[PDB]
Design a binder for these strands. Sequence first.
RNA 1: UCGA
Lengths: 109, 243, 56, 48, 282, 97, 227, 227, 93, 49
Amino acid sequence: RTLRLRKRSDIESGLYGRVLAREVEALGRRLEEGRYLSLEDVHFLIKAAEAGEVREVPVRSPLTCQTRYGVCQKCYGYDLSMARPVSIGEAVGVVAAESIGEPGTQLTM
Amino acid sequence: QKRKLQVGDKLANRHGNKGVVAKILPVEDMPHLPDGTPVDVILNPLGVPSRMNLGQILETHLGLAGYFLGQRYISPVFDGATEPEIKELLAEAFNLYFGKRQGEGFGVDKREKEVLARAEKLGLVSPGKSPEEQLKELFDLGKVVLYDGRTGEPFEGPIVVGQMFIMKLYHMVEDKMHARSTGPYSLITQQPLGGKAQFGGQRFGEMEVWALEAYGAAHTLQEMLTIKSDDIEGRNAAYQAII
Amino acid sequence: RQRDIKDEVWDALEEVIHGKVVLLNRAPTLHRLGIQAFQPVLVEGQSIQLHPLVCE
Amino acid sequence: LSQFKDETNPLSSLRHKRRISALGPGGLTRERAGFDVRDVHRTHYGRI
Amino acid sequence: ITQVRKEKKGAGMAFATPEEALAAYERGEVALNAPIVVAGRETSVGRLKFVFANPDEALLAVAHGLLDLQDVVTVRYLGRRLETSPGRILFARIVGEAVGDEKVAQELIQMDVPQEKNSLKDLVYQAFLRLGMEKTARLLDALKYYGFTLSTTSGITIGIDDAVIPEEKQRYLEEADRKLRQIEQAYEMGFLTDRERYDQVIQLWTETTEKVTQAVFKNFEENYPFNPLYVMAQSGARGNPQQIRQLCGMRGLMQKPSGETFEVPVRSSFREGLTVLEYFIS
Amino acid sequence: ASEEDRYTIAQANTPLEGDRIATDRVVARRRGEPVIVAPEEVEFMDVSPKQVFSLNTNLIPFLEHDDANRALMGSNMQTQAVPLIRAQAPVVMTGLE
Amino acid sequence: KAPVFTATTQGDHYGEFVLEPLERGFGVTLGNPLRRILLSSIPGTAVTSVYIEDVLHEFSTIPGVKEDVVEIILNLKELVVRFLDPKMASTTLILRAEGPKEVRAGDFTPSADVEIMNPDLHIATLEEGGKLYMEVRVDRGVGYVPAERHGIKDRINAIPVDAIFSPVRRVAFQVEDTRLGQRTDLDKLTLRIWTDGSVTPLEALNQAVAILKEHLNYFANPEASLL
Amino acid sequence: KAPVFTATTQGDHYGEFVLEPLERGFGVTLGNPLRRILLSSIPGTAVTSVYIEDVLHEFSTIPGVKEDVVEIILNLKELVVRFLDPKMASTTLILRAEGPKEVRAGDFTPSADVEIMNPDLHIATLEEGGKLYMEVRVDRGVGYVPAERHGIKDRINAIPVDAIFSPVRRVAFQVEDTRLGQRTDLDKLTLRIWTDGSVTPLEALNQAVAILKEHLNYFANPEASLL
Amino acid sequence: AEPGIDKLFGMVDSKYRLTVVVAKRAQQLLRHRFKNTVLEPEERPKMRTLEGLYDDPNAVTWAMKELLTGRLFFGENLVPEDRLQKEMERLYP
Amino acid sequence: GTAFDQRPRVRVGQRVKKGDLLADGPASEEGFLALGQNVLVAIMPFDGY
RNA sequence: UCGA
Ligand SMILES: [Zn+2]
């Protein structure tokens, strides 16, 4: 019943290469919207939340994307493998597909 | 045809450890012993703890003490050699080995002194005992002093060695290896053939296609599904082009 | 005709080799990294060499 | 139940002749198999 | 090679002056890597005996055969007084030489503790992040060549005595036997019925398996930290904990093909050898 | 098999001495259920542990030290074997050859 | 100091060498390179070429002969022969064994510039009335070249065999401490040379040392450059 | 067949030499000997113990100087000199500086034919009124000799110092299999060598190779002990 | 990796845009037998050869350094395809 | 395609008992299955090969 | 049916 924090790897998978939906005020360092995220950013959010400054994390997600027959960069994130903002004309459907596809062999346990 | 074992061929033991031949090393360079007899394989100790097979280890130890003796070893399944037995075999073979160098006008090698000293740090050989007894213990553990056939210097620590049984597996690179530039095509659809003796190219799976798209190589994919495979004038005009 | 691979060929294919590179795939193809691309380097043998790290 | 002999070595044909398959005409088929089908029964022991 | 070698032989005695401790080092009353005390500030015999003004000096002194590849010594190395192991300095060095400058290189790496899987990973990320693609690639390849040849020099191998079952096995396991005698004498006393006896037994073998596993790892750390199997699976080279348990330890109870787990302990490890029974159940 | 489920069957690894039972507690089972027994209830035994495996699997020395997976692999690989001109039988074998 | 050098041979077969004293750690640097080139670049024979009036190929079993052809070949590369001349590149040998008499390297037809180092080498156990004619070209070269990488072409069937030249059986060097010099912990290097008799241990060490010093002083005028 | 030798060097610091190509296995054959002989030989700076006014122990701090005694010792080790005349195998350099002075390898008061090839080195910093005098002992020879081995004490309070001999820092040759035309068996062997400025990399190399052909020519006279 | 990559990717927004660029330009280099290009003798991507050391025939590498300088120009709807392609096959054979 | 061969292991003549092996097999060493060889083996990470 |  004690509310804890999602352990490192979780949020690392959650907020990495994200795009800020709205402005953020915590710990004196202001995070404007549209700014992408890195390990520095994410760990900073970690610490900030550890200070009880912030809990919710508004971000633009593929679900929230109104791009039709596709998606956008602001709704997506980095390119992961390239660590840089996702390039236009990207395979993201297939990306996703393979990304969760390879693990298919290793959950027997 | 006489087929000598080539580079890349499948080989494995009775204890279930596979592999392929990687770059056979010249007789010159090789981790030999004070008798100057180099080893024949030098297999990496990784697949052992992950795949959990100790039988090859014990087999190699019995082969260690046994090579010196040459006598055979019948170890029926679940009933056979045990740690004390093989231990005595080790002590035996070593007694006669240290004997081999003692009467032939030799003694403890300085490099061996070094290896024994470094091993004495982690308690690998019981301290307070002379290097002779220490090499008795070490050799008993399954490992002895090896010298890099390249540098000539020993190795930081002991290396388990011995006689062990292996096998030359059916799959042979001289067979499995195949390639084709431009061959025949299927009658129904102009798609190239497959198989080896049929002289045909590999197929690009659905998942292959997907991955190719994931990279975002549009042309590579297009050429793959068209020019490179069955395309009407595509393959022909291709051969034309590169020619 | 005639396996006469004498230096006329062995070193010309070389002149075409440099620059453009080829691809290698290990089935199953799961991650896209299951298909990568490498600079061709001709080596004596019937086997295939590849960088130990990407093998994973 | 009838196929190319295993001549890869003597022990090959030996073992092969000593192998048993639940597949074929009037056994089960690939499409139908469970856990208990390919499993090892308690009393298996010195038999298979 | 990045491992910090430390010995318990010296016992860490109390010396008012360095010279006393030195004489003691010669006489064998202390170990080279042993954390002894000098004046009011403790230190290793090596940190005193071996003092280097720069990496290349230490490289010569070591590779010449006067010092082991891993010991506690003192060096400057980019303008600071630090006490570490030759393989550490080597690490930072190779990083720098691979990337082209050792400043930022050494800056983002741990200069204290041995480098295993995850640490390396972090460094790779920091590399492709702060540096760029080609740089990171050349870096990785340097790790390939250097690393491979390092493990080659090591000659770390695997043998029967390279994993030894802790002495705690006999004790704790036969204790579990006595406990089983308790539970069994209960089952006929009416205190415990059948099912709950099965449960008490199942948790008995649970906690037994854990006691002996803990014993395995603790024994490998307290005594033989350079143990090849241990080190191997530890640094993330090859292995997992359960593997090490079954290989040296108690393999633990098995599961019936029906899915209800067995009530009978397998005990003996892979090296101990398993009886026909255990092997079949497994 | 049906008849095997009936009696109490010991193991080949039983405490064999002087053609008699040595230690009180002895390996045994019914239907495949491991149970410790006594010098009395002893009924049947095993000829040899060899019967608990196949041909190739029995050609592996110290097999009790190898996990089932790699053992399996070892066996079917013994099937995958090819002839050798200079071939040399294992200097350590199970004596079954 | 003075590098006292004592050179022990025994026959053309087994011999060792000891040099003491020497600088600390040098013994490695001496011992290994020697051994390295000592096991490789040393010329030898182990034949190449073989012909028999009775055979199709390397297989077909010759009547009156226990072992098949390729087994008689198992006995070929294990045969060591030295020439009494340095200048004889190639050669030829003739062999005849009739009746129920066995075959060995000594059973050959002796000639000029040829000596066998193992007449006791077993070839084939010839049964009752086995008649066989044989001939072999034993040439000399460097290193080891398999039969598949070199051709012959004598007559109706000319079948190559592996060439293991490398007359040195094996080389083992050991670095010990010597009392023979001014300071402490010096290197007395003992190089153990095992030869088959095509070359005595002494002269083996000689030629090895030759290629050694030569390829050593191979560093000539270089070409410098700077960024 | 034609072992082309190329050496690309920069300054008295770095040099890299390749013999491309070379026979298989030979590329690894010359690597370690040249390695150890380069680092275990080829004499140089070799700076031993130095007496220091007011400084007794190697520990007790020195007033008027920023760095403590040991730091200065490090700075001393780093320095490199050379004897112009082979006659002088031993010298004692001295320095005395007071007040707020910048103390460097240049400030060092000169000597006989001894020359300092390292003009700028930061030895120490002197605060206001800081008094310092030191006389350092310098010699020749090879390898490495820690404060344990040499018991050098010139004056009363002089403190033994680790001596840097061999001009080279590290070598650790990099050999790789190369390809020219056919026959992948070639050797590309390359060397990365460092120098402290005493001898240019090419010099150190050639000196080493001299040591090499010398010790190689140690084999002439046999002594026959055959058992 | 391929020399001068990070900057390349650093130019075009789309990771794929670069590919289009490289493709088209390189193909154009193969069209005219390398007399188009903005690379001078020192910048000529020479490939090492035992026979004799010549310019690397591969169009890709050439394109690499070509953009690496930045002397080129890349953009969508740059000029009508007509006069664009007509004056390219004119200047050079 | 695996070769089948039988090597006579008996001399020109001698007297044998019943069951004694007069000839080998595709892999048979003196009445024992010979798959591979027992050759010297070392265990260590050699140049990562 | 057997490799991976
Ligand atoms: Zn969007």
